[PDB]
Write a protein that binds this ligand. Structure first.
Ligand SMILES: Nc1ncnc2c1ncn2[C@@H]1O[C@H](COP(=O)(O)OP(=O)(O)OP(=O)(O)O)[C@@H](O)[C@H]1O
Ligand SMILES: [Ca+2]
Lengths: 374, 139
């Protein structure tokens, strides 16, 4: 209405963050699911909307064949990944995509074809006037007002370390680790189930998770917190199930997050959060390294475990040369960092001397992403 | 007049501040460039590194373009379909930095350097579009 109104759409594997560029928070956060109606045998009819999406298809559940379109940041199905997008505009912000430019968010190491597909779609299908695809991690670093640094992104399915130089992700040094929320949840369950707390499943897996977000913290020294764990009681915390008992965790609080730094805890051969971060940096140019070590930003839910900063601050310091200042930056709002980042980016007059215009999509086609978007 | 035509064409924007056409085929030589800038000084050792054998070492040390320390960002110089490598200069203390994108062709290497605040995507598309023109004229 009273201005150009660019939009931001930060696509999480789980939660889709929509919004108008220039805001404080995603003015719409919905699950990324598409329910595809059913019942079987093959019936008397089914009715409206051959596909339901977002918060609505979420209730539906028992009637709809619910589907997750994105896996580990990467788009699994364009048919229903389109439905979520369609919905974002025509159902959430209730805008005609035709009049608003838009920032699309993406994952580090998004395959080429996915990029192009994403492009052809926004332009031919929704007819966006202009768009721009940005790596989720770059936007997070912007949210903390920086351009050069290293982001440690840990959401639900995987963790990436993205060393960014002046706003440009350096793919050669981007590292990916298969540990994130889920893993911490499955461990905690397995470790709570020890005093037969047996949550397992009856809608009981979400209880482990809520314990995880609510009661887990991170230890500065595992062994020593372990010893003090055994000496007991100002570290032993209780938790109330819905219908029932007040449970108790102790050793469990600081033990699940510790697998981050010690994946053998999870039976997996793998470097930890800290060494991974370190490995990326070594893969970078000798001249920017000192500026990566003093700009390790954290983003994503799995980074919210209290204490993760200091354990991070201490663990990298023992892996690296003294010559530099290790300085883990961990912004208070690191859950919505990515959207806020692009809100800021899509707020600048420069975003306009930065993106793909429809004219450009007509002259060049989807391959125009491998060009403009980096 | 000559390759100088393509150059003038490349700077006419007000966005770039340096261009250059360099032949890499066995006897490196700048064929035309913005004079009094940096690219004009690109040497055969330097050119011999961009069109190199390994596409890894420059990630650690870097590379100079006329004695300018540049950080490689993306590298697709040898990969078909793309033909591009993107760099960012390496300033010193607040000194502003600029993006550079070199795109290869059958015979030439088209370099392009943006002004202050020009996004790499701009400079890439532009340097790319030009490389395709030489690329179609057997150049
Ligand atoms: N406050 C918190 N403290 C600790 N862990 C948290 C907290 N909030 C969320 N988490 C956990 O960390 C992860 C958060 O990731 P996020 O919310 O970005 O996930 P998603 O959208 O479901 O998926 P993906 O990250 O794969 O895109 C989840 O596994 C969640 O359980
Ligand atoms: Ca997520």
């Amino acid at each position: 209405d009273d201005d150009i109104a660019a939009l931001v759409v930060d696509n999480g594997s789980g939660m889709c963050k929509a919004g108008f560029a220039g805001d404080d928070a995603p003015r719409a956060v919905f699950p990324s699911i598409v329910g595809r109606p059913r019942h079987q045998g093959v019936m008397v009819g089914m009715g409206q909307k051959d596909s339901y999406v977002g918060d609505e298809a979420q209730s539906k559940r028992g009637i709809l064949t619910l589907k997750y379109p994105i896996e580990h940041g990467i788009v699994t199905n364009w048919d229903d990944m389109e439905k979520i997008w369609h919905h974002t505009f025509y159902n959430e912000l209730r805008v005609a995509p035709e009049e608003h430019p838009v920032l699309l968010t993406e994952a580090p190491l998004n395959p080429k074809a996915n990029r192009e597909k994403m492009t052809q779609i926004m332009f031919e299908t929704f007819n966006t006037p202009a768009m721009y695809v940005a790596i989720q991690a770059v936007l997070s670093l912007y949210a903390s007002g920086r351009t050069t640094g290293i982001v440690m992104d840990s959401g639900d399915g995987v963790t990436h370390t993205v060393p960014i130089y002046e706003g440009y992700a350096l793919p050669h040094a981007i590292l990916r680790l298969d540990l994130a929320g889920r893993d911490l949840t499955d461990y905690l369950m397995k470790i709570l189930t020890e005093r037969g707390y047996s949550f397992t499943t009856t809608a009981e897996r979400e209880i482990v998770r809520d314990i995880k977000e609510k009661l887990c913290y991170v230890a500065l020294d595992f062994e020593q917190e372990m010893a003090t764990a055994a000496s007991s009681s100002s570290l032993e915390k209780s938790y109330e199930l819905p219908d029932g008992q007040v449970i108790t965790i102790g050793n469990e609080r600081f033990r699940c997050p510790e697998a981050l730094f010690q994946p053998s805890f999870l039976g997996m051969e793998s470097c930890g959060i800290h060494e991974t971060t370190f490995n990326s940096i070594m893969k970078c140019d000798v001249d920017i390294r000192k500026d990566l070590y003093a700009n390790t930003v954290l983003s994503g839910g799995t980074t919210m475990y209290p204490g993760i900063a200091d354990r991070m601050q201490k663990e990298i310091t023992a892996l690296a040369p003294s010559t530099m200042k290790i300085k883990i930056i961990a912004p208070p709002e690191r859950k919505y960092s990515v959207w806020i980042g692009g809100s800021i980016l899509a707020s600048l007059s420069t975003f306009q001397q930065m993106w793909i215009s429809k004219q450009e999509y007509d002259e060049s086609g989807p391959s125009i992403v491998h060009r403009k978007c980096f | 007049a000559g390759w100088n035509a393509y150059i003038d064409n490349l700077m006419a924007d007000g966005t770039c501040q340096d261009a250059a056409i360099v032949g890499y085929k066995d006897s490196p030589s700048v064929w035309a460039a913005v004079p009094g800038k940096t690219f004009v000084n690109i040497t055969p050792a330097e050119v011999g590194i961009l069109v190199g054998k390994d596409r890894s070492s420059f990630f650690v040390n870097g590379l100079t373009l006329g004695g300018q320390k540049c950080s490689v960002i993306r590298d697709s110089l040898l990969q078909d379909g793309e033909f591009t490598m993107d760099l960012r200069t390496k300033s010193t203390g607040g000194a502003p930095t600029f993006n550079i994108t070199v795109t290869m062709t059958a015979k030439t290497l088209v370099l392009l350097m943006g002004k202050e605040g020009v996004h790499g995507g701009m400079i890439n598309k532009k340097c790319y579009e030009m490389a395709s023109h030489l690329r179609r004229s057997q150049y």
